[PDB]
Amino acid sequence: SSKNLGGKSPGKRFGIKKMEGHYVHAGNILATQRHFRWHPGAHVGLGKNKCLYALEEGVVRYTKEVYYKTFVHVVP
Amino acid sequence: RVPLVPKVRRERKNLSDIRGPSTEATEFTEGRFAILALGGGYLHWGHFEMMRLTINRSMDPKNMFALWRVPAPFKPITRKGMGQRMGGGKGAIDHYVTPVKAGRLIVEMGGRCEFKEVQGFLDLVAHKLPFPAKAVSXXXXXXXXXXXXXXXXX
RNA sequence: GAUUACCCCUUCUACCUUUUGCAUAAUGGUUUAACCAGAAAAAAUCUAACAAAGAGAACUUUAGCUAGAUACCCCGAAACCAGACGAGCUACCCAUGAGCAGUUUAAAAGAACCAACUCAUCUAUGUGGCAAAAUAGUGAGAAGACUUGUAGGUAGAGGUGAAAAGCCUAACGAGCCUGGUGAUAGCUGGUUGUCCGAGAAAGAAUUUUAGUUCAACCUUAAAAAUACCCCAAAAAUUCCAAUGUAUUUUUAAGAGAUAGUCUAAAAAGGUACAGCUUUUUAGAAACGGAUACAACCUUGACUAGAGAGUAAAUCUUAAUACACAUAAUCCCAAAAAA
RNA sequence: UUUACCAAAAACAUCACCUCUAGCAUUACUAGUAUUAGAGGCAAUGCCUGCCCAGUGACACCAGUUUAACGGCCGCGGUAUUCUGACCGUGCAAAGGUAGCAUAAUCACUUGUUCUCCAAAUAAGGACUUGUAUGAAUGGCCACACGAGGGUUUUACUGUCUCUUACUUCCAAUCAGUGAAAUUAACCUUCCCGUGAAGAGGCGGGAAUAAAAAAAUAAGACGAGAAGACCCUAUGGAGCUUUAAUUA
RNA sequence: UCGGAGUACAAAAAACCCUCCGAGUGAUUUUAAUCUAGACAAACCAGUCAAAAUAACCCAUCACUUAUUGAUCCAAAAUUUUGAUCAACGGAACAAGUUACCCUAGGGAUAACAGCGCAAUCCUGUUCUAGAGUUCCUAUCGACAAUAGGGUUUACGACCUCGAUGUUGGAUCAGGACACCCAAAUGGUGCAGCCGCUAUUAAAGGUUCGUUUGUUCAACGAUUAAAGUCCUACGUGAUCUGAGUUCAGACCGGAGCAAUCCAGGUCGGUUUCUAUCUAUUAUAAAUUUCUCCCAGUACGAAAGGACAAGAGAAAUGGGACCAACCU
């Protein structure tokens, strides 16, 4: 009866795993996102899936800059 | 008046147009007399067209002009075949309707000012609609809004 | 409960099973007696023996080892297979016997009608019967492919069958008896003394949807932690002070649950239908109130007490132009407009 | 002749017709021999049984033959008042329904149209043919006689009926003797309007009512009686059939 | 099975036989060598990011950005990898139908018949007054819409019932509703009169007998004051009927290689029960019609042509009776 056909796609749970003020560790996943919602800041690495991670031990901090970019930093 | 390319999939019923009291089109502008909606509802294309025929047959010979703020319906109506069951895919589109909120101007008329003809005709139109229609002029609408605000403040 | 050494009045919708929900016009039961359905220790918890060793010549062992004590019930098929019993019923056939008035008639065991005998057309009666195939009236064959006695033959991975999926010992899509066998049943119908504490309605999969396997929960017994309600620094929430709180896990064993609904709000389908279906959020299930009635309203649940104070609720509010089908009123009667 | 025990019928059998396989021996056939035996279809008799062998089957061997073997036997366009199309053209196929029959045991539209029958005929009989979806041995068309088969029309006669009435006998009823059965949770067992899993004698509110039988009526107690024979579920069973797969 | 964009508004996730598009890969150049932390997601199993160390140099673009695959055991080019459209995609190495001859275990947790809920559909009363009716909106109609009632149609939902509520029609026996067919009381009429049309009030009574076919129907015949409609489990099978239909046979036609079927048409096909409880085993006063008389007057060119009052006959039916006739 239904001519149209489509499937369902399981969620990959995109989002931010950590928050500002939290104490993280080196190698920990910060934010999993599609394309760029935000940009990597100091002491923060970029992945192939565009997922930002922490390079060294420290504290996560969010900072907005307009020259329109959003950077995430890790302060040891 | 029919949609040029109705290849666009049928729209779901939001019901927010029935609930929402939009003051957007309530602006009186150049029109000396107009029609107001006292309730939310979907206005059929047949209603609008026969309202156009109504305002055409009732046209004042000396000076009259008809202006419709309500655009051609972008929202189709879905109905399954008679005697069928529930589900098994959506049904067939019977016709289109225009969502109408409260305060939206249905019809505005340019021309000379006579209370006798205007009130009566807009009353006939009010009888031709599923929702109560309010014949409106600037002074009456401002006085009704000021009286409603003064009665709500007390 | 009162009340008289008895009764009327007042206060209450059987039990059980199955279910989202049963006094239910869903299930089971005549009553009584009696019979009748949780018997398995590996790892573990616990009580003791000894301890780098335990244990009756066998195994384990960076506190183990040995012993004892703790948790997993019954009934039921339709059928399959094996070995045999069955043609004194019935189907066919073999051997050997017997039977089938009378009338019209040209030679005619020749034709037609009609008793016996062999069949069961129609109607009625009978319907725990006269009888688990009947009786009464009526009807067919009635020298033929006829009827019948006795002695024999053919059986189930078949026989027979003027062939209907019929018959083969009163039910044959494949007999019956015994054995395999306590076959298999994710189903349905069942599973018995007291008291105390805590206390479940949906995450993904499955030749899967009436069943299972670990999460979402829960329970027992110990330890080490801390956890939540969470404002501005920041991205309805996701995080975190403080507050007043108690808990949140970690580990060791052990469960059950996975065919549910309605209201309120936001949606989708449907017709701005449904006690409608498909999702999200929240609530939900004394015996108070709503006439009665699953969620609506009030309240969180000790026993005892001829005490008290309250919550919701109960009887009424709104009007004018010089149409369904048994007996009424939307719970009695009436009333009025703290 | 046939479903013993819901079907007795158009079904099966039957004489007859045809096709096709068997040249052979001593516990079938058969102590038989092509005029015999087995197999299949049809079914007295009467008149007939036309075309197609590309596929399957069968026989001679790779090619062909074989329809009383399994089966198959068309469409469109054009042509004379109207209509119709003897005729012609064309596509396709192995070959495109010949005789006869036909709203039929076949016809959907349908109660086809016309005629007969009747005061009225969806039935029946007789014709017409655009035969959805007849057809020549699963035979075609008729046929005297025959039929506890299936239908239609006049006459005759009737309690069938208008329209029922009376009588007789066996039961029912009474008494006495002997003394069941299924069913049954317990029953103090009313009705109406509403509610309750939506059809209440047990709930609510009104109405009605001292307590118990016998002879009768069958509305209710979703009465009694069969763990629905329809539907669906179970990785149930069994029978039957094959180019399902797998092979003693 | 998988991926993306909405349903699924400012971290996740979230269904429907909801809604749009995409894949089992396609191509161009450089080439992904060894392993140490630490995290995301996650029931199991499969998926992502990656500082840093060592050896040797000094992955990337398009198909919008991501998709574009497969867990065990078993085979092979050879000693390291290549093969299943296991697509029913968490995958029984290997397999299609029929049963109306059926049987068993089950379920109203799930269909058909009826009830119930709903009222799209169905029927009907109304609202507005454009436009017909010569003239004239509303005697009689109501373009297009709007507000409702009803629970007889067709459906939706699957709420009691599958340890059974027996499903059409007819016969029998009724009761009730009013949206009144007739009889009664009226209004308007394009109502002269007689008859009609339309609407209001009213359910007490009545609402026929036949032919064809199973009708629910429909056509037709003869009357009648009329030959109303609906509900009551589309009333009524513990009252009957089996004509229809619900299952064992015999043909035609269609479908299928076949076992066999078809919501198609012709024939045949046993219908079980003794009443336990509740309920029930009548007082009455009527109801309908035709004919005659005034009359063939008023009225009208003609055609035509009563209200009232009076009289005589029946009919249905209530309650009866046997003197005659009749059995």
JSON list of N, CA and C (backbone and C1' of nucleotides) in Angstrom, two decimals, chain E residues 92-104:
[
{"chain": "E", "resi": 92, "resn": "A", "atom": "P", "xyz": [19.84, -18.08, 10.19]},
{"chain": "E", "resi": 92, "resn": "A", "atom": "O5'", "xyz": [20.83, -19.33, 10.13]},
{"chain": "E", "resi": 92, "resn": "A", "atom": "C5'", "xyz": [20.66, -20.35, 9.14]},
{"chain": "E", "resi": 92, "resn": "A", "atom": "C4'", "xyz": [20.98, -21.71, 9.70]},
{"chain": "E", "resi": 92, "resn": "A", "atom": "C3'", "xyz": [20.75, -22.88, 8.76]},
{"chain": "E", "resi": 92, "resn": "A", "atom": "O3'", "xyz": [21.94, -23.42, 8.19]},
{"chain": "E", "resi": 92, "resn": "A", "atom": "C1'", "xyz": [19.57, -23.21, 10.85]},
{"chain": "E", "resi": 93, "resn": "A", "atom": "P", "xyz": [23.41, -23.05, 8.71]},
{"chain": "E", "resi": 93, "resn": "A", "atom": "O5'", "xyz": [24.35, -23.77, 7.65]},
{"chain": "E", "resi": 93, "resn": "A", "atom": "C5'", "xyz": [25.12, -23.01, 6.72]},
{"chain": "E", "resi": 93, "resn": "A", "atom": "C4'", "xyz": [25.38, -23.77, 5.43]},
{"chain": "E", "resi": 93, "resn": "A", "atom": "C3'", "xyz": [24.16, -24.24, 4.65]},
{"chain": "E", "resi": 93, "resn": "A", "atom": "O3'", "xyz": [23.56, -23.21, 3.89]},
{"chain": "E", "resi": 93, "resn": "A", "atom": "C1'", "xyz": [25.76, -25.98, 4.76]},
{"chain": "E", "resi": 94, "resn": "C", "atom": "P", "xyz": [21.96, -23.05, 3.89]},
{"chain": "E", "resi": 94, "resn": "C", "atom": "O5'", "xyz": [21.45, -24.23, 2.95]},
{"chain": "E", "resi": 94, "resn": "C", "atom": "C5'", "xyz": [21.76, -24.25, 1.57]},
{"chain": "E", "resi": 94, "resn": "C", "atom": "C4'", "xyz": [21.36, -25.56, 0.93]},
{"chain": "E", "resi": 94, "resn": "C", "atom": "C3'", "xyz": [19.93, -26.00, 1.17]},
{"chain": "E", "resi": 94, "resn": "C", "atom": "O3'", "xyz": [19.00, -25.37, 0.32]},
{"chain": "E", "resi": 94, "resn": "C", "atom": "C1'", "xyz": [21.39, -27.82, 1.56]},
{"chain": "E", "resi": 95, "resn": "A", "atom": "P", "xyz": [17.96, -24.29, 0.91]},
{"chain": "E", "resi": 95, "resn": "A", "atom": "O5'", "xyz": [16.53, -24.89, 0.55]},
{"chain": "E", "resi": 95, "resn": "A", "atom": "C5'", "xyz": [16.17, -25.16, -0.79]},
{"chain": "E", "resi": 95, "resn": "A", "atom": "C4'", "xyz": [14.83, -25.86, -0.87]},
{"chain": "E", "resi": 95, "resn": "A", "atom": "C3'", "xyz": [13.66, -25.13, -0.22]},
{"chain": "E", "resi": 95, "resn": "A", "atom": "O3'", "xyz": [13.11, -24.12, -1.05]},
{"chain": "E", "resi": 95, "resn": "A", "atom": "C1'", "xyz": [13.66, -27.39, 0.46]},
{"chain": "E", "resi": 96, "resn": "A", "atom": "P", "xyz": [12.19, -22.97, -0.41]},
{"chain": "E", "resi": 96, "resn": "A", "atom": "O5'", "xyz": [10.95, -22.88, -1.41]},
{"chain": "E", "resi": 96, "resn": "A", "atom": "C5'", "xyz": [9.62, -23.12, -0.96]},
{"chain": "E", "resi": 96, "resn": "A", "atom": "C4'", "xyz": [8.70, -23.45, -2.11]},
{"chain": "E", "resi": 96, "resn": "A", "atom": "C3'", "xyz": [7.21, -23.44, -1.81]},
{"chain": "E", "resi": 96, "resn": "A", "atom": "O3'", "xyz": [6.66, -22.14, -1.78]},
{"chain": "E", "resi": 96, "resn": "A", "atom": "C1'", "xyz": [7.74, -25.38, -3.05]},
{"chain": "E", "resi": 97, "resn": "G", "atom": "P", "xyz": [5.24, -21.87, -1.06]},
{"chain": "E", "resi": 97, "resn": "G", "atom": "O5'", "xyz": [4.20, -22.69, -1.95]},
{"chain": "E", "resi": 97, "resn": "G", "atom": "C5'", "xyz": [2.88, -22.92, -1.49]},
{"chain": "E", "resi": 97, "resn": "G", "atom": "C4'", "xyz": [2.13, -23.86, -2.41]},
{"chain": "E", "resi": 97, "resn": "G", "atom": "C3'", "xyz": [0.78, -24.34, -1.91]},
{"chain": "E", "resi": 97, "resn": "G", "atom": "O3'", "xyz": [-0.26, -23.41, -2.15]},
{"chain": "E", "resi": 97, "resn": "G", "atom": "C1'", "xyz": [2.03, -26.19, -2.71]},
{"chain": "E", "resi": 98, "resn": "U", "atom": "P", "xyz": [-1.41, -23.17, -1.05]},
{"chain": "E", "resi": 98, "resn": "U", "atom": "O5'", "xyz": [-2.25, -24.52, -1.09]},
{"chain": "E", "resi": 98, "resn": "U", "atom": "C5'", "xyz": [-2.98, -24.89, -2.26]},
{"chain": "E", "resi": 98, "resn": "U", "atom": "C4'", "xyz": [-3.59, -26.26, -2.12]},
{"chain": "E", "resi": 98, "resn": "U", "atom": "C3'", "xyz": [-4.43, -26.50, -0.88]},
{"chain": "E", "resi": 98, "resn": "U", "atom": "O3'", "xyz": [-5.74, -25.98, -0.98]},
{"chain": "E", "resi": 98, "resn": "U", "atom": "C1'", "xyz": [-2.95, -28.32, -1.19]},
{"chain": "E", "resi": 99, "resn": "U", "atom": "P", "xyz": [-6.47, -25.36, 0.30]},
{"chain": "E", "resi": 99, "resn": "U", "atom": "O5'", "xyz": [-7.02, -26.63, 1.09]},
{"chain": "E", "resi": 99, "resn": "U", "atom": "C5'", "xyz": [-8.00, -27.47, 0.50]},
{"chain": "E", "resi": 99, "resn": "U", "atom": "C4'", "xyz": [-8.09, -28.81, 1.19]},
{"chain": "E", "resi": 99, "resn": "U", "atom": "C3'", "xyz": [-8.42, -28.78, 2.67]},
{"chain": "E", "resi": 99, "resn": "U", "atom": "O3'", "xyz": [-9.80, -28.62, 2.93]},
{"chain": "E", "resi": 99, "resn": "U", "atom": "C1'", "xyz": [-6.60, -30.24, 2.30]},
{"chain": "E", "resi": 100, "resn": "A", "atom": "P", "xyz": [-10.32, -28.32, 4.42]},
{"chain": "E", "resi": 100, "resn": "A", "atom": "O5'", "xyz": [-11.59, -29.27, 4.59]},
{"chain": "E", "resi": 100, "resn": "A", "atom": "C5'", "xyz": [-12.90, -28.77, 4.40]},
{"chain": "E", "resi": 100, "resn": "A", "atom": "C4'", "xyz": [-13.59, -29.41, 3.22]},
{"chain": "E", "resi": 100, "resn": "A", "atom": "C3'", "xyz": [-12.76, -29.46, 1.94]},
{"chain": "E", "resi": 100, "resn": "A", "atom": "O3'", "xyz": [-13.11, -30.62, 1.18]},
{"chain": "E", "resi": 100, "resn": "A", "atom": "C1'", "xyz": [-14.68, -28.13, 1.58]},
{"chain": "E", "resi": 101, "resn": "C", "atom": "P", "xyz": [-11.96, -31.64, 0.69]},
{"chain": "E", "resi": 101, "resn": "C", "atom": "O5'", "xyz": [-12.20, -32.94, 1.58]},
{"chain": "E", "resi": 101, "resn": "C", "atom": "C5'", "xyz": [-13.48, -33.56, 1.64]},
{"chain": "E", "resi": 101, "resn": "C", "atom": "C4'", "xyz": [-13.61, -34.43, 2.86]},
{"chain": "E", "resi": 101, "resn": "C", "atom": "C3'", "xyz": [-13.44, -33.73, 4.20]},
{"chain": "E", "resi": 101, "resn": "C", "atom": "O3'", "xyz": [-14.60, -33.04, 4.63]},
{"chain": "E", "resi": 101, "resn": "C", "atom": "C1'", "xyz": [-12.16, -35.72, 4.18]},
{"chain": "E", "resi": 102, "resn": "C", "atom": "P", "xyz": [-14.55, -32.12, 5.95]},
{"chain": "E", "resi": 102, "resn": "C", "atom": "O5'", "xyz": [-13.01, -31.79, 6.13]},
{"chain": "E", "resi": 102, "resn": "C", "atom": "C5'", "xyz": [-12.47, -31.48, 7.40]},
{"chain": "E", "resi": 102, "resn": "C", "atom": "C4'", "xyz": [-11.70, -32.64, 7.98]},
{"chain": "E", "resi": 102, "resn": "C", "atom": "C3'", "xyz": [-11.26, -32.49, 9.42]},
{"chain": "E", "resi": 102, "resn": "C", "atom": "O3'", "xyz": [-12.29, -32.80, 10.34]},
{"chain": "E", "resi": 102, "resn": "C", "atom": "C1'", "xyz": [-9.46, -33.30, 8.11]},
{"chain": "E", "resi": 103, "resn": "C", "atom": "P", "xyz": [-12.45, -31.95, 11.70]},
{"chain": "E", "resi": 103, "resn": "C", "atom": "O5'", "xyz": [-11.33, -32.54, 12.66]},
{"chain": "E", "resi": 103, "resn": "C", "atom": "C5'", "xyz": [-11.36, -33.91, 13.04]},
{"chain": "E", "resi": 103, "resn": "C", "atom": "C4'", "xyz": [-10.08, -34.32, 13.73]},
{"chain": "E", "resi": 103, "resn": "C", "atom": "C3'", "xyz": [-9.66, -33.47, 14.92]},
{"chain": "E", "resi": 103, "resn": "C", "atom": "O3'", "xyz": [-10.35, -33.82, 16.11]},
{"chain": "E", "resi": 103, "resn": "C", "atom": "C1'", "xyz": [-7.79, -33.87, 13.51]},
{"chain": "E", "resi": 104, "resn": "U", "atom": "P", "xyz": [-10.66, -32.70, 17.22]},
{"chain": "E", "resi": 104, "resn": "U", "atom": "O5'", "xyz": [-9.26, -32.44, 17.91]},
{"chain": "E", "resi": 104, "resn": "U", "atom": "C5'", "xyz": [-8.59, -33.48, 18.61]},
{"chain": "E", "resi": 104, "resn": "U", "atom": "C4'", "xyz": [-7.18, -33.08, 18.99]},
{"chain": "E", "resi": 104, "resn": "U", "atom": "C3'", "xyz": [-7.03, -31.82, 19.82]},
{"chain": "E", "resi": 104, "resn": "U", "atom": "O3'", "xyz": [-7.28, -32.05, 21.20]},
{"chain": "E", "resi": 104, "resn": "U", "atom": "C1'", "xyz": [-5.45, -31.80, 18.06]}
]
